């Protein structure tokens, strides 16, 4: 299933304040009016080409985390971002992920670790995420807005810049549920979670003309090669 | 040699109450101090070996800290399972020495004792000796006064006492006393009495019996 | 001897609070602990509270553990007991007693003086 | 350093540090510290330089062994306990704890490996306690002709000289390859002045000009702003924001 | 895992020497150092000495130098201690511990313990216990229950195991600690709580066993009025 990405996927490129000017920026951006896969709970491994755009418009916070790494479940290092009731957990430990990562406490077995980090939780409401890995930096941009993709224009602000230089080619998402079996090789056992949908898009090297208002907020953009 | 002092001698607090203890050394130290848990007649269980360093299996309940001549240990809360004596150790030198030991026991309200008396049997009397035993059961205080009033007269220096441990079931205590006399001395008297005084009792409790009954 | 006295008390409103005082002088105060007692009109005695030398926590009976708080002052030989949430049953005479057993955890029951307390 | 829980050099402790600040003005340089040495770089350069990560190893050795903790050294400690390569770069912080960590006739707890079948590899650690082949073939947990045990005890005491006292030594190793700098040694090193032309630095962004309060509204994630034609107009104070 | 196995209780006359053993199993015997400790009946622990079998050397405490020797043999992985010129006060609980704090960056502290050996020094001789019943009076009943049991007297040496009804009854069980008579013999006491409706009629039996010689003695008890 595919849907339309009208004008979403724009984000602040360089953390530089600009007031009432038009700036031409060349970077990895989601093309306007692009086709993005449509997945609903009621979850395959997808490639991690140069850019990925993640969106979710599901209430109750069924979507809770993501997984990133090359040769998933192997000795190679991998990420593990989950949203607990108190704080987010980011781990770079080459976790041995199973076929069914998590639908219910831990989606992987013990493994060596190189970096750890904790912060406040990231989570009828639309959640948007942009993930880029370049020059040894993994950058996250996020935005929240009550809520198909709404026509509303919104620019994603940077969230955190992890100084991790691992190599990445694939990723997968994590879902939350209750009264379900912790089967590593099976899913949907027991009680079924509530309705939830999430969209996946891919960025491409494009030129954009971002419009900065008097307060330094991006209010409009033009897909230069549309 | 190095001598250490542990104070206070004993602690008393109910379940769910904070408890703490301190250990002192002859000279200032900054490491090599351990804390032990020893149940009655059982081998000590390791709790802390190095300053604020717990070994494998120690719960988060117990923590320790200190510097210089004196070191302190704390217990956040109590449960019946950990009712025993704590000891302090210093092993910075081979001549190991161990602290005097401190006891922690459950704290609760008053329970009136059940005073009982055992008169001697015929078989015991046939051996040329006689004895009378008085028992106190299921009362709070860890020590109770037992007075013998043979022939309505106080007696001392002719009886022995036995001591039990705290009852985990209800945190109670028991005490018993044993009077001993020879056949000639036993037949000399006519009335045997045992008196007990306790805070919970409204008045002193006396149990007595005569030679002919 | 063991001459003792108490002060305060009297008529009080139900559900309120009251304060009572007891003190001694001219004799040792450490070797004997200070205890209280209760006596309803023409009824048996009832223990209230007692304080030890160390002052580690407090001692109370079953019917007074959760309502009454007791304390002692070793530097002035004066002791106090706390009255709160008074109920109709508290119409009796209280007594201040001395635990006449030297350095003993238990207590020897002996009262020196008392006063009347009643709720309107 | 204050823990001093590395009495035995043999089977030494290891630690990893990253994403931190290593202020050396307080470490290995205050009055309590006795000795401090570095290899391949001066302390000032280390303080002014940044490193990817630092690995810390701690151990207590006698005076005759401190000289062995250096690149390309040889000796009992170097060969059997803690060997280092000739190209090793790092620092060693050594403090003598004889007064506070010695006994009149004690200190038997300070053990070290006196013999071994072969020298350890660079930065290698070994906890094996097998008998050393003292001339004759090594014993298999038995006694034999000589079959001497490798480990031995220092047995520090006042009767020994300064060269045979419990020097608490901590050695740090620095990494610089693939360095997204996360460990640095600089102090606060901040000073502010406004309303006059001055050279300034705000996490870089070197420039010259007059600094004055601005009425702009910077976003939480924005550090500095640019006017038309990419001219640095305003900058956020790292400390006061 | 790591474990230690110790021998049973041994009794020998004063002035001679006593032999004890403590076997080690698991891992490699060369990686364990055996330390010896003693515990008297109420007094704190006492340290005798420590040996490292792989070293071939040993050390002893100043208070116990000379009179104490420690030997261990790798072939059967057991450690032994020798005590000479024993005295009555030597009666104490003896433990064997592994001074493992010499290899993995961990110093001068024990982690492993044995089972413990009981040794008593006295001029008495080994013999079985003497048991007689109690005859509580009816008038002494308090709270609807009565106290009863059996007494174990004139036995030597320890340990002594006392149970009831072949272990079939365990409610309200109390067994006070052992005592030493002025004549050199030990004793024991036990008391139960029984309801009024069962005393005198129920087939209550007191059980006793002397494990040094495996002697079996049991008797019945009944109150009187
Ligand atoms: C990451 O690893 C894959 C193989 O798992 C490899 O094909 C790819 O080239 C690597 N990435 C980079 C940037 O070299
Ligand atoms: C800019 O922010 C100010 C202050 O919050 C506000 O009054 C003004 O309306 C904002 N303008 C725009 C275009 O957002
Ligand atoms: C830095 O510290 C100073 C003094 O404690 C404080 O006033 C200021 O707000 C702090 N700024 C940041 C960004 O932590």
């Amino acid at each position: 299933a595919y849907t339309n990405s009208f004008t979403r996927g724009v984000y602040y490129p360089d953390k530089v304040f600009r007031s009432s000017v038009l700036h031409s920026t060349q970077d990895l951006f989601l093309p306007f009016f692009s086709n993005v896969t449509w997945f609903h709970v009621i979850n395959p491994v997808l490639p991690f080409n140069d850019g990925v755009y993640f969106a979710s418009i599901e209430k109750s916070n069924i979507i809770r985390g993501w997984i990133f790494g090359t040769t998933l479940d192997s000795k190679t290092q991998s990420l593990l971002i989950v949203n607990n009731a108190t704080n987010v957990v980011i781990k770079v430990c080459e976790f041995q992920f199973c076929n069914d990562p998590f639908l219910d406490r831990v989606y992987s077995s013990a493994n060596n670790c190189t970096f750890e980090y904790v912060s406040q939780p990231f989570l009828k409401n639309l959640r948007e995420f942009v993930f880029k890995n370049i020059d040894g930096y993994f950058k996250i941009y996020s935005k929240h807005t009550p809520i198909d993709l709404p026509q509303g224009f919104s620019a994603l602000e940077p969230l955190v810049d992890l100084p991790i230089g691992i190599n990445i080619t694939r990723f997968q998402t994590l879902l939350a549920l209750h009264r379900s079996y912790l089967t590593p090789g099976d899913s949907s056992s027991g009680w079924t979670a509530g309705a939830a949908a999430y969209y996946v898009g891919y960025l491409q090297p494009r030129t954009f003309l971002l419009k900065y208002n008097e307060n330094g907020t991006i209010t409009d953009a033009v897909d230069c090669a549309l | 040699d190095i001598q250490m002092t542990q104070s206070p001698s004993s602690l008393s607090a109910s379940v769910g109450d904070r408890v703490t203890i301190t250990c002192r050394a002859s000279q200032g130290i900054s490491s090599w101090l351990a804390w032990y848990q020893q149940k009655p007649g059982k081998a000590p269980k390791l709790l802390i070996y190095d300053a604020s360093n717990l070994e494998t299996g120690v719960p988060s309940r117990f923590s320790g800290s200190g510097s210089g001549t004196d070191f302190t240990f704390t217990i956040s809360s109590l449960q019946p399972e950990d009712i025993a004596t704590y000891y302090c150790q210093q092993y910075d030198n081979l001549p190991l020495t161990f602290g005097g030991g401190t006891k922690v026991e459950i704290k609760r309200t008053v329970a009136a004792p059940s005073v009982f008396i055992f008169p001697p049997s015929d078989e015991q009397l046939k051996s040329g000796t006689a004895s009378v035993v008085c028992l106190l059961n299921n009362f709070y205080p860890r020590e109770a006064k037992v007075q013998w009033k043979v022939d309505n007269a106080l007696q001392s220096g002719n009886s022995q006492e036995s001591v039990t441990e705290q009852d985990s079931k209800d945190s109670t205590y028991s005490l018993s006393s044993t009077l001993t006399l020879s056949k000639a001395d036993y037949e000399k008297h006519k009335v045997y009495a045992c008196e007990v005084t306790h805070q919970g009792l409204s008045s002193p409790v006396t149990k007595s019996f005569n030679r002919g009954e | 001897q063991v001459q003792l006295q108490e002060s305060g008390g009297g008529l009080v409103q139900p559900g309120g609070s009251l304060r009572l005082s007891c003190a001694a002088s001219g004799r040792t105060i450490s070797r004997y602990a200070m205890s209280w007692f209760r006596q309803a009109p023409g009824k048996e005695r009832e223990f209230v509270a007692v304080a030890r030398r160390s002052g580690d926590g407090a001692f109370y009976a079953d019917s007074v553990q959760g309502r009454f708080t007791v304390s002692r002052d070793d530097a002035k030989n004066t002791v106090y007991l706390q009255m709160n949430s008074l109920k109709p049953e508290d119409t009796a005479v209280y007594y201040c007693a001395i635990d006449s057993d030297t350095f003993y955890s238990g207590s020897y029951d002996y009262w020196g003086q008392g006063t009347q307390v009643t709720v309107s | 350093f204050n823990a001093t829980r590395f009495a035995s050099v043999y089977a030494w402790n290891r630690k990893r540090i990253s994403n931190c600040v290593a202020d050396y003005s307080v470490l290995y340089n205050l009055a309590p510290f006795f000795t401090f040495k570095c290899y391949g770089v001066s302390p000032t350069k280390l303080n002014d330089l940044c490193f990817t990560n630092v690995y810390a190893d701690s151990f207590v050795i006698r005076g005759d062994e401190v000289r062995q903790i250096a690149p390309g050294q040889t000796g009992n400690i170097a060969d059997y306990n803690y060997k280092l390569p000739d190209d090793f770069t790092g620092c060693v912080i050594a403090w003598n704890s004889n007064k506070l960590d010695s006994k009149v006739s004690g200190n038997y707890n300070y053990l070290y490996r006196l013999f071994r079948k072969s020298n350890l590899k660079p930065f290698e650690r070994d906890i094996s306690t097998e008998i050393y082949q003292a001339g004759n073939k090594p014993c298999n947990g038995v006694a034999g002709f000589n079959c001497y045990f490798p480990l031995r005890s220092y047995s520090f005491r006042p009767t020994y000289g300064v060269g045979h006292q419990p020097y608490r030594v901590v050695v740090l190793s620095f990494e610089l390859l693939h360095a997204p700098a996360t460990v640095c040694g600089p102090k606060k090193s901040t000073n502010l002045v406004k309303n006059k032309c001055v050279n300034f630095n705000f996490n870089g962004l070197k420039g010259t000009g007059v600094l004055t309060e601005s009425n702009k509204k910077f976003l939480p994630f924005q550090q500095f702003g640019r006017d038309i034609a990419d001219t640095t107009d305003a900058v956020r104070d790292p400390q006061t924001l | 895992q790591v474990q230690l196995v110790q021998s049973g209780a041994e009794v020998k006359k004063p002035g001679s020497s006593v032999k004890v053993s403590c076997k080690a199993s698991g891992g490699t015997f060369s990686s364990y150092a055996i330390s010896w400790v003693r515990q008297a009946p109420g007094q704190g622990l006492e340290w005798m000495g420590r040996i490292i079998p792989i070293f071939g050397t040993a050390n002893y405490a100043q208070k116990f130098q000379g009179r104490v020797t420690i030997t261990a043999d790798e072939s059967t992985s057991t450690a032994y201690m020798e005590l000479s010129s024993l005295r009555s006060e030597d009666t104490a609980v003896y433990y064997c511990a592994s001074l493992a704090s010499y290899s993995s960056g961990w110093e001068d502290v024990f982690d492993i313990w044995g089972q413990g050996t009981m040794v008593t020094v006295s001029s008495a001789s080994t013999k079985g216990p003497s048991v007689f019943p109690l005859a509580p009076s009816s008038k002494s009943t308090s709270g609807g229950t009565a106290a009863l049991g059996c007494l174990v007297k004139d036995y030597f040496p320890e340990p002594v195991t006392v149970s009831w009804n072949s272990g079939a009854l365990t409610s309200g069980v109390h067994t006070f600690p052992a005592v030493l008579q002025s004549s050199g013999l030990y004793s024991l006491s036990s008391v139960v709580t029984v309801p009024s409706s069962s005393l005198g009629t129920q087939t209550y039996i007191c059980n006793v066993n002397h494990k040094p010689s495996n002697t079996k003695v049991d008797k019945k008890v009944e109150p009187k009025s």
Side-chain angles (χ1 to χ4, degrees), chain A residues 1-19 21-26 28-57 61-70 74 76-85 87-93 97 101-104 106 108-110 112-119 121-122 125-142 144-146 148-176 180 182-191 193-213 215-219 221-226, chain B, chain C, chain D residues 1-4 6-27 29-61 63-64 66 68-73 75-82 84-85 88-97 99-100 102 105-106 108-116 118-120 122-123 125-132 134-145 147-158 160-167 169-174 176-181 183-186 189-215 218-226 229-238 240-241, chain E:
Chain A
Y2 304 70
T3 183
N4 189 3
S5 161
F6 292 84
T7 52
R8 319 207 77 76
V10 70
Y11 60 93
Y12 297 83
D14 59 354
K15 321 169 90 165
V16 173
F17 172 87
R18 296 190 191 73
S19 66
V21 298
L22 279 293
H23 184 237
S24 185
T25 305
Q26 189 273 329
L28 297 199
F29 292 164
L30 183 63
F32 279 15
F33 303 99
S34 184
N35 277 348
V36 298
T37 60
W38 186 350
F39 292 165
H40 182 74
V41 178
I42 313 302
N43 314 337
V45 178
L46 322 177
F48 192 76
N49 309 313
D50 285 318
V52 55
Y53 162 87
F54 192 99
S56 60
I57 294 169
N61 307 312
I62 296 89
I63 198 73
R64 208 154 283 203
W66 311 284
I67 298 298
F68 314 92
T70 60
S74 195
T76 307
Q77 280 293 343
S78 53
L79 270 292
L80 188 148
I81 310 176
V82 286
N83 292 319
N84 285 345
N87 297 286
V88 184
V89 181
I90 298 85
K91 285 176 181 282
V92 184
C93 300
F97 315 116
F102 179 28
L103 176 74
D104 201 54
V106 192
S108 181
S109 302
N112 289 337
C113 291
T114 63
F115 178 76
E116 303 91 334
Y117 174 109
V118 184
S119 60
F122 295 168
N125 48 5
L126 182 64
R127 278 85 172 86
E128 317 188 326
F129 294 87
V130 168
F131 292 164
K132 183 178 179 180
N133 189 358
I134 47 172
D135 64 271
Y137 273 112
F138 192 84
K139 324 177 73 153
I140 296 89
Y141 303 74
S142 301
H144 292 47
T145 286
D148 51 22
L149 283 175
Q151 296 294 321
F153 181 92
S154 179
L156 281 70
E157 318 171 274
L159 183 63
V160 65
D161 189 2
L162 294 174
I164 300 313
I166 64 170
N167 169 19
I168 183 64
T169 61
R170 310 177 77 192
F171 64 91
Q172 184 178 2
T173 191
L174 307 176
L175 277 56
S180 182
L182 288 160
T183 46
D186 196 14
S187 188
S188 84
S189 185
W191 188 75
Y198 74 90
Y199 302 165
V200 176
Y202 286 63
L203 321 178
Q204 295 169 224
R206 304 278 272 208
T207 301
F208 270 55
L209 188 71
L210 305 173
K211 172 155 205 61
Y212 285 84
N213 67 347
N215 286 339
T217 308
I218 296 162
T219 78
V222 172
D223 198 308
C224 198
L226 183 63
Chain B
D1 301 331
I2 302 161
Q3 278 59 22
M4 50 175 94
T5 302
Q6 276 189 235
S7 304
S9 59
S10 184
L11 276 297
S12 185
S14 76
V15 174
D17 287 344
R18 178 71 69 82
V19 174
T20 182
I21 190 167
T22 181
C23 170
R24 214 211 81 241
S26 292
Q27 69 275 19
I29 63 184
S30 62
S31 50
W32 303 91
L33 192 146
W35 288 89
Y36 291 166
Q37 158 61 294
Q38 204 274 350
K39 285 181 173 182
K42 311 305 185 180
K45 276 65 63 178
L46 277 296
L47 185 58
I48 299 292
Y49 54 101
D50 170 39
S52 180
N53 197 1
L54 60 87
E55 72 278 12
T56 318
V58 176
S60 65
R61 157 63 56 72
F62 302 107
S63 301
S65 296
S67 298
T69 62
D70 192 301
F71 280 69
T72 177
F73 174 80
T74 181
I75 303 95
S76 78
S77 165
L78 312 164
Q79 286 75 242
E81 62 262 9
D82 60 23
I83 286 304
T85 316
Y86 292 165
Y87 290 78
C88 181
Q89 186 196 19
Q90 201 156 303
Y91 43 98
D92 48 358
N93 224 327
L94 294 174
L96 310 185
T97 61
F98 304 154
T102 298
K103 190 77 195 60
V104 63
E105 289 155 316
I106 300 298
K107 209 274 192 184
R108 54 157 204 83
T109 56
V110 189
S114 297
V115 190
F116 189 76
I117 193 66
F118 295 83
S121 61
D122 291 344
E123 297 191 36
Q124 190 200 133
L125 296 172
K126 282 174 178 185
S127 71
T129 69
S131 177
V132 186
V133 187
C134 198
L135 271 66
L136 287 72
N137 201 39
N138 298 349
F139 62 97
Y140 181 76
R142 298 167 27 73
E143 52 262 17
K145 178 261 283 179
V146 190
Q147 183 65 288
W148 288 102
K149 265 174 188 176
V150 183
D151 291 348
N152 304 294
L154 60 90
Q155 312 300 321
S156 65
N158 54 352
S159 73
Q160 293 191 339
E161 286 75 46
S162 186
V163 159
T164 74
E165 305 303 317
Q166 188 166 37
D167 192 353
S168 63
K169 264 71 79 180
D170 51 2
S171 163
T172 55
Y173 180 77
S174 303
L175 186 142
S176 67
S177 181
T178 301
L179 182 65
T180 305
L181 288 173
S182 81
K183 68 187 288 185
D185 298 307
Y186 178 71
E187 292 197 332
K188 188 183 72 171
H189 313 104
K190 291 184 178 182
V191 171
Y192 299 76
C194 172
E195 293 210 331
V196 169
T197 298
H198 178 235
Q199 59 202 334
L201 298 167
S202 188
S203 65
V205 162
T206 299
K207 310 251 164 193
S208 60
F209 64 92
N210 70 12
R211 176 59 175 83
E213 303 183 45
Chain C
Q1 297 80 16
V2 294
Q3 59 93 29
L4 197 65
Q5 60 88 32
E6 162 194 40
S7 66
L11 272 287
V12 294
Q13 297 183 347
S17 296
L18 174 63
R19 297 282 291 203
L20 281 153
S21 299
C22 171
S25 57
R27 56 190 187 79
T28 309
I29 202 71
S30 181
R31 82 186 195 178
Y32 295 149
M34 194 294 307
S35 67
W36 281 40
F37 289 101
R38 174 188 264 275
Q39 184 178 2
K43 291 187 74 171
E44 292 289 311
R45 305 184 60 73
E46 292 86 2
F47 162 75
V48 181
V50 58
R52 273 77 66 81
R53 295 159 280 286
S54 67
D56 295 316
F59 200 88
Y60 311 101
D62 165 18
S63 184
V64 299
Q65 56 174 336
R67 199 152 64 92
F68 304 162
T69 68
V70 73
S71 189
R72 63 179 284 165
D73 309 319
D74 270 26
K76 298 184 291 189
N77 313 329
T78 185
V79 302
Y80 265 69
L81 183 63
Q82 183 63 44
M83 281 325 288
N84 64 7
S85 59
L86 277 72
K87 302 296 185 175
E89 191 36 79
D90 65 1
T91 177
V93 298
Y94 293 173
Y95 290 103
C96 199
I98 314 301
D99 294 332
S100 65
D101 198 351
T102 191
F103 300 112
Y104 191 63
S105 62
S107 169
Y108 288 168
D109 300 332
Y110 193 46
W111 60 88
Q113 193 262 329
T115 52
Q116 169 59 32
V117 59
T118 303
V119 290
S120 65
Chain D
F1 297 163
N2 278 277
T4 73
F6 40 91
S8 64
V9 60
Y10 150 69
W12 41 264
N13 165 59
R14 183 157 178 93
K15 180 64 174 182
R16 186 176 179 167
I17 287 159
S18 63
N19 297 315
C20 168
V21 179
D23 180 15
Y24 282 98
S25 76
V26 175
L27 311 167
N29 292 283
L30 287 174
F33 303 99
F34 291 1
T35 46
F36 164 57
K37 190 177 289 189
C38 293
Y39 310 112
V41 56
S42 71
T44 62
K45 290 292 187 179
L46 287 162
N47 189 353
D48 294 346
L49 189 55
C50 287
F51 294 148
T52 317
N53 59 65
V54 176
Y55 284 97
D57 300 331
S58 73
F59 50 93
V60 173
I61 48 171
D64 64 345
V66 296
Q68 307 181 34
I69 317 306
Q73 280 290 67
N76 48 12
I77 302 308
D79 294 348
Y80 317 134
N81 295 256
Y82 190 74
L84 288 164
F88 167 57
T89 179
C91 300
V92 296
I93 305 94
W95 169 64
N96 187 7
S97 68
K99 187 168 179 178
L100 305 177
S102 191
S105 57
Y108 303 90
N109 318 307
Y110 304 79
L111 305 196
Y112 68 97
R113 186 180 274 108
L114 180 62
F115 308 116
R116 202 175 180 282
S118 62
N119 296 2
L120 295 179
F123 313 109
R125 194 173 67 169
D126 186 7
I127 61 172
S128 181
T129 49
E130 189 57 284
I131 289 182
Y132 165 67
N136 72 312
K137 63 184 175 69
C139 287
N140 70 297
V142 298
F145 186 84
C147 283
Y148 304 154
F149 195 82
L151 305 184
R152 215 211 78 175
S153 187
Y154 282 114
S155 84
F156 300 110
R157 52 202 63 193
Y160 297 172
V162 301
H164 285 284
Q165 273 173 13
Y167 292 89
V169 179
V170 178
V171 57
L172 309 177
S173 67
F174 309 120
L176 294 95
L177 304 176
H178 316 292
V183 180
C184 299
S189 299
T190 78
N191 43 307
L192 180 60
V193 67
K194 296 183 290 294
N195 290 318
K196 64 173 281 203
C197 189
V198 298
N199 290 318
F200 59 87
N201 187 324
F202 290 66
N203 320 288
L205 183 63
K206 307 173 172 17
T208 305
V210 298
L211 285 72
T212 61
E213 293 179 353
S214 66
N215 59 5
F218 274 30
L219 301 178
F221 67 95
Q222 286 163 337
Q223 296 287 28
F224 61 94
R226 295 180 163 143
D230 291 331
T231 45
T232 311
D233 192 308
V235 173
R236 188 193 288 281
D237 187 325
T240 62
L241 307 183
Chain E
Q1 291 188 343
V2 298
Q3 291 92 347
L4 291 176
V5 178
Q6 295 198 237
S7 62
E10 296 183 356
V11 172
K12 177 68 76 212
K13 316 316 164 214
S16 77
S17 178
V18 293
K19 273 311 315 168
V20 296
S21 313
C22 165
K23 182 175 172 70
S25 61
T28 65
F29 173 82
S30 66
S31 305
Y32 304 92
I34 301 95
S35 184
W36 300 98
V37 183
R38 184 181 90 219
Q39 167 76 333
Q43 181 266 326
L45 281 69
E46 276 277 30
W47 183 76
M48 295 298 102
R50 173 255 292 160
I51 188 166
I52 301 95
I54 194 69
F55 294 179
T57 195
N59 64 298
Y60 308 99
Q62 178 57 89
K63 177 174 172 174
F64 297 99
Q65 265 159 26
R67 58 170 63 87
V68 165
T69 301
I70 288 159
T71 59
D73 53 39
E74 76 298 337
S75 55
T76 190
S77 75
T78 313
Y80 310 94
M81 183 278 288
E82 290 82 3
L83 190 48
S84 62
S85 76
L86 272 76
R87 201 257 306 277
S88 59
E89 268 69 45
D90 287 307
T91 303
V93 189
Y94 189 58
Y95 295 101
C96 77
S98 185
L99 179 46
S101 63
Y102 79 94
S103 56
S104 67
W106 183 64
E107 300 295 323
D108 183 68
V109 285
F110 55 82
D111 203 43
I112 308 94
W113 279 108
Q115 293 77 18
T117 61
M118 294 299 291
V119 305
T120 302
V121 182
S122 181
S123 58
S125 62
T126 315
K127 57 179 175 289
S130 59
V131 182
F132 58 89
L134 272 295
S137 65
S138 59
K139 281 160 168 159
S140 54
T141 55
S142 185
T145 68
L148 61 83
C150 286
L151 293 154
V152 194
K153 260 67 180 151
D154 317 311
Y155 70 86
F156 180 94
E158 271 197 347
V160 162
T161 63
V162 179
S163 66
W164 283 339
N165 281 78
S166 306
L169 178 55
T170 54
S171 187
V173 171
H174 305 285
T175 305
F176 302 167
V179 296
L180 167 54
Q181 301 172 18
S182 291
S183 62
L185 299 170
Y186 285 22
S187 299
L188 280 162
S189 307
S190 199
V191 289
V192 67
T193 313
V194 295
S196 294
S197 310
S198 68
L199 60 91
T201 60
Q202 173 61 305
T203 314
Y204 195 91
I205 280 158
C206 64
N207 214 50
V208 177
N209 187 359
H210 185 251
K211 259 177 178 176
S213 63
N214 206 42
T215 307
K216 176 73 211 83
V217 180
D218 52 1
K219 303 291 220 213
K220 199 194 175 196
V221 298
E222 292 187 4
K224 66 168 187 277
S225 178

